[PDB]
Amino acid sequence: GYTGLVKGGDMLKELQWQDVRGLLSIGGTIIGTARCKEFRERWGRLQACYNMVSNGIDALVVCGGDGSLTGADLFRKEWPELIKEKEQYETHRNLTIVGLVGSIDNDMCGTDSTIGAYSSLERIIELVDYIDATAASHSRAFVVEVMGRHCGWLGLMSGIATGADYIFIPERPPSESNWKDDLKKVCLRHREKGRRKTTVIVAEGAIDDQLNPITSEEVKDVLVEIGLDTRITRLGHVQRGGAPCAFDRFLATVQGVDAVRAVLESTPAIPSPVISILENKIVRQPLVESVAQTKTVSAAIEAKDFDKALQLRDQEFATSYENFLSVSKYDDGSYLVPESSRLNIAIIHVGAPTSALNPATRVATLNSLAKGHRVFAIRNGFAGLIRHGAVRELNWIDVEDWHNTGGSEIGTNRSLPSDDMGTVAYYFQQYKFDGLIIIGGFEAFTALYELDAARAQYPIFNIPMCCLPATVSNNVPGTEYSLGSDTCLNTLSGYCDAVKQSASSRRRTFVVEVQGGYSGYLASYAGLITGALAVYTPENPINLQTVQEDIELLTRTYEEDDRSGKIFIHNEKASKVYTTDLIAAIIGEAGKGRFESRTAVPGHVQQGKSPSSIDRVNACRLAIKCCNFIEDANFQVKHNANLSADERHLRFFYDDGVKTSAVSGKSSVIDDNTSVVIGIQGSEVTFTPVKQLWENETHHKWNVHWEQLNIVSDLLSGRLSIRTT
């Protein structure tokens, strides 16, 4: 850290292109870290300055947390102060300083997420997943002491990701007077409703509204006096170690490239930035403002004004807290709606499996049941419905352990209502469904469209319907994110880490085949995060010249190496000629049998055992938004009308000859806005009607660009350098 900048001599050493080999699967730091201590004093910062000028250092890149950036900000403020005892002065007169947020906390302002935050969250989830993975006992409780000194983000996200009963966060602390009694209430309420795996999450900075800390031991004692055998689990240093997760690998690599750009793109007129992330877009925020904003949250908490602090957190934090609070309070009965307003909700899993299916179905069932609606799960897709009438009613107890479980508990398949509309329409009428959630991929998108189009032929289908996109491919129109894709990237990065290790008299080069459909997104993302040499995709042409170029890069790369083992990412649908098998075969014969080429096919393992935290958090956000849409009273039959039972089921009535909608009161019975695709655009959730999306989509299973994934990966592998000499 700063110690090497203060005692800067042998502590300042150059880094070569080969020195940073395989660092994308390592963590923490090879440069090593240190606490801000001598850099807290002016004479220390003066010496740090001398060393930079003396060693001809013109730019500094600080990758650290709140404290490290507060220091970087103070060093830039105090830099115009250069004491003299030389051309060195005019040369190094203007400090070029850029900041990267390396923090598990996720405390820093201006950025939606900091480097290490999701990985640390993964470590928490890793542990709570073991706790959850035991068959339930009659009177058991578990306390998880999570790290993160300055921000309740980890505590919150762990709460959502694990389905915790109660959480302790510095932003919204409980009363000193009755937190124990409120803890008891919440827990016993859930226990009453069927919960046997009572879980509480205590943050590192957990406090009560009078600033008194809340230890996990304090919390244990509360639950023990409720007759529960409580067990503390302290994560400790586990939360800071290990390989970064899929998102962090992307986040650090991308922000890291921009940090270098920000240095070059600098002038004294353009202020010193903090490389931040906002609506999945990398942004350059000013260091001055970001450190200042972050200090005001710390101040708010210290000043016992926790309202200012929670208000001072981004929408990401706000929406997440609101969601955790909602789900927790579903047991209240406060969500309950009048008898007349209660509906029959259908959930179906259309497409190949993703680990994200059960968590999403869980949140959707609880949300619906909380209102008094009846939840019916169409088992084994449309085929299960058509062939066997496979409908199963869900209750509070049925949902149990689903937030952790992968695949489908009801069954998922790519069969379409097309197979027999008449039969689908018969069953929808029998079970009297008033709303439908199609969780799945391109076939869930297809089914939504087909059923929407069938509204004409079958009145029963004129209900609100939605597609919750869940797929590994990220090939569904109407969203930037499909549930299960982050789990897949995590599964792939880990898989490749084991590939490169087995590539160290066995094997040298590996052609890892990525199954991401007809879209190069999966392959491109995977390539960036695994440090793949070449990435084969349907979007980019494969031929004798391209192949020769790929071989040349591999050849030129290997004739420099002295940790090794190289990978190529081949998308299953890239070429009907140059397949994973042919590419591997050409690499082998290359250099008159120079290296040993091997194929690797993770394949159906890409769905993963447990959904990632990004998948768990989003499955919950979107399931909530699905229910809010289909169960919206605006799209539902009006109860103060002279309507017959059949008129209310048909959702239309004939008034004075005119066919009127029992919902809108309008002459046009069919509303196209009721069949919608619920997805993410930036940070915001979007509702997009199928009819419009269906003309836009391609027969190549769907305009969309992830080009910069490929640009950055090629810059960081030898590609861009070999391509330009």
């Binding site: 069954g411 084991a498 290790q501 094997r507 194929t599 096919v601 394949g603 159906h604």
Partner: protein
């Protein structure tokens, strides 16, 4: 009626040079007559760990 736990067939690469993972699976589909399908899982020489 029973639990849907899933089905696996493990084939050591050396068990047959002719009846390979991919060949075996295509025979299963042929013989299954649409009642179920077969898919391969070929992880590769990554199993080292």
């Amino acid at each position: 009626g029973k639990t849907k736990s899933g089905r696996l067939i493990l084939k050591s690469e050396n068990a047959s040079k002719v009846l390979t993972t991919e060949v075996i699976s295509t025979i299963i589909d042929d013989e299954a007559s649409g009642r179920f399908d077969s898919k391969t899982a070929i992880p590769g020489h990554v199993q080292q760990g």
